[PDB]
Amino acid sequence: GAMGSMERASLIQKAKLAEQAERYEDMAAFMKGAVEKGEELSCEERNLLSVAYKNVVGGQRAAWRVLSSIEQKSNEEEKGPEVREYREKVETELQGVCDTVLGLLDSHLIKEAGDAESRVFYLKMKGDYYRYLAEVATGDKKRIIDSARSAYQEAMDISKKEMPPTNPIRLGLALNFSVFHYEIANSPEEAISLAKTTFDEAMADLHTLSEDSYKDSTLIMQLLRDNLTLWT
């Protein structure tokens, strides 16, 4: 890696500067270099890793959807191979970013994560990046969907045993697993059931929270409510 020669602490410092500068490709490269030092990540460092890669793949996914829409419209005047070629280029780069994140999780972030807050976060990330692979998959599509489901399910099982129903990681996991069920697995009723149960169990535990914890949990509950409004 091009970051091998940089101190861990300097890569984390530069990841925070790259986030201020909205330089997300740089931020991801810094955080990849930090993970490759081989030490476990703190909570704040896990959040830097996730912000960096979510912003990089977010741009790729948005671009892929614009190009896939143009391609679908072309296939309903012949304009040649260029729309397909360029959608394929962006797709291959998106797949490559997803494979990079999956490879960091498999070598060796998940296996060295023993605390529920790290293990659930990494397994959610594994589900999310398989989900992004599944969004573009047409060929192993079933096995990619099962890989997303399996990671989300293991994260869910640990989260329900080890975390309160208001824990923001547990909430964001359930939110993203419900999107998986609705958009990827063609299970809208599973999506709606999981969002409603998650919202209701969280609402009944808000009384236990500080004002700051309450704000963190209710922000994510509002996303569950927004999806249930969209879906019902």
């Binding site: 979510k54 999310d128 999107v179 609705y182 996303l223």
Partner: peptide, 9 residues
């Protein structure tokens, strides 16, 4: 149209 997944800050 598309649902909200976790929005990361």
């Amino acid at each position: 149209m598309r649902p909200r997944s976790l929005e990361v800050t």
